[PDB]
Amino acid sequence: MKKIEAIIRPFKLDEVKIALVNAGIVGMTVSEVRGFEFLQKLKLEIVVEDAQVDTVIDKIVAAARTGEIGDGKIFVSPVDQTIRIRTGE
């Protein structure tokens, strides 16, 4: 299993919020960070099985392209254990 983190610099921002939502990357979470002129950036994170890493990287890149794409970086790192809990509404 791997964690995928992407830090991307929106140009067409709102267009990229839409990109991210339309991308259909289930379980992805997003937060704002700043890089350096302080630059607002989006940070995306998701944990997937090893066999899914390239697929998710591709969806992130394709989403970024529909917006900016500008500058961005993606990191893949190991995950030892995951526990996922779902409760019906």
State the residues that interact with its own copies by CB under 8 A.
2-3, 7, 21, 27-36, 41, 43, 45, 47, 57, 61, 64, 68-87
In angstroms, how far is CA 7 from the centroid of its own chain?
Answer: 7
Which of residues 13 and 45 has its CB atom nearest to its own copies in the complex? 45
Asked if 18 and 39 touch (Cβ cutoff 8 Å), the reply is no
Q: Which does 72 bind (CB under 5 to 8 A by kind): its own copies, Cl ion, none?
A: its own copies
Q: Which phi and psi angles does 54 have, rounded to 5°?
A: -65, -40
- Which residue is listed with tokens 């995306």? 44
Q: Residue 4 CB, nearest distance to Cl ion (Å)?
A: 9
Displacement of CA 89 from its chain's centroid (Å): 26
Identify whether the C-beta of residue 57 lies closer than 8 Å to the C-beta of residue 4. Answer: yes
> Per CB under 5 A, which region of 10-18, 20-28, 36-44, 52-60 contacts Cl ion?
20-28
| Residues of this chain that bind Cl ion (CB under 5 A) | 27, 46-47
